[PDB]
Amino acid sequence: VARPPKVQVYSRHPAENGKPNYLNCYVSGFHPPQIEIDLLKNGEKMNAEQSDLSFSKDWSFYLLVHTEFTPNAVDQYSCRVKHVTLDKPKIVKWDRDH
Amino acid sequence: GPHSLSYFYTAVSRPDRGDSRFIAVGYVDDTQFVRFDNYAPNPRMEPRVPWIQQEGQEYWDRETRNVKETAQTYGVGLNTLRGYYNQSEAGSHTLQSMYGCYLGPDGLLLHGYRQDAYDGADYIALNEDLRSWTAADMAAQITKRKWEAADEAERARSYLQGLCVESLRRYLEMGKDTLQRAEPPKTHVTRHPSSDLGVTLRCWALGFYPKEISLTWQREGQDQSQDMELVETRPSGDGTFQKWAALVVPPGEEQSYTCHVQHEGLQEPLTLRWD
Amino acid sequence: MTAHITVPY
């Protein structure tokens, strides 16, 4: 059985424009483990770290993809997930009010 | 709750690359402290927090040798289960294991576990008494017969009652500043007008450890519990966690609502109120 | 520290 990923996108600290911060895309609950997670800045892929593959007590996998960033007023951030359960990639926009 | 040491193994067959990938992660409580990934440069057990870096080279050497042999066993294991299930060689499959020990008040094992899943479904597990196994299907019954003939349950029990809790107790000492001194949440409430007759209040808890926490909303005494949207607790990126809980309230009243925060890092439950 | 996990499936 294949389980689709759940996706949260958020900053490590409360976002304030001009102040350096960290952008997180937490992807969880999925199976099989093959997955492609990209943080996007204005639609374009960012360089980011990805955590070591781990899984929850129900066997479903989770990964954290993160990079440093400095939010401003104009730039739009999102995280885009591809997985066998998804016909089209799942895109979650970053909202500083999460 | 009781402290724990746990390892999480994921083996994935990769016929497109001619091999299998094996990853191991180790946790003390909610803290990942080691990893192994045989698709990474020079596959080995590697540190993932500062406090384990005080282990000497023989520690790393033994962990690396041991996990390399496990990856070998799991590569053949993926081969073997594919045969048990009459499956073709072209597809990728997953073999997972998790095992670990919880620390009792005497420094001995409180309870421990060892469990497997194949392709995301339970396959075999060590029972609560650490002396017997439960097989999910006819395939895992084959594995069960092999492990019984090899007295694997005694090997498991010994590990869980011995090396596992002893290593746990040592790690708890080395990482005391984070593993045994809880970091309390940083808390604030934000306000979002959301409709003519509703304002959204969001109670944030940020940067806390361990990950267990309680956030609830209460208007003058009674707990709101039909629809206060609460996100799954999520990692901050620095080894701490964050969560929020939000509810919609009438514009007449925001001051009358109280967010209550329970966490081990707070000597006493915290209250937060308006925006 | 990890367990000795090498008994075949």
Author numbering:
A (entry chain B): 3 to 100
B (entry chain A): 1 to 275
C (entry chain C): 1 to 9
Lines quoted from the article behind this entry:
MHC-I is a cell surface glycoprotein that is responsible for the presentation of both endogenously and exogenously invading pathogen-derived peptide antigens for immune surveillance.
The two structures, pSLA-1*04:01MY9 and pSLA-1*04:01 (R156A)MY9, were determined in the C121 and P1211 space groups with resolutions of 2.0 Å and 1.8 Å, respectively. The space volumes of the D pockets of SLA-1*04:01 and SLA-1*04:01 (R156A) were 26 and 52 Å3, respectively. This explained why SLA-1*04:01 (R156A) preferred to bind to hydrophobic P3 residues, regardless of the size of their sidechain. Moreover, 156Ala did not change the negatively charged characteristics of the entire D pocket, probably because of the surrounding amino acids such as 155Arg, so SLA-1*04:01 (R156A) could still bind P3 acidic residues.
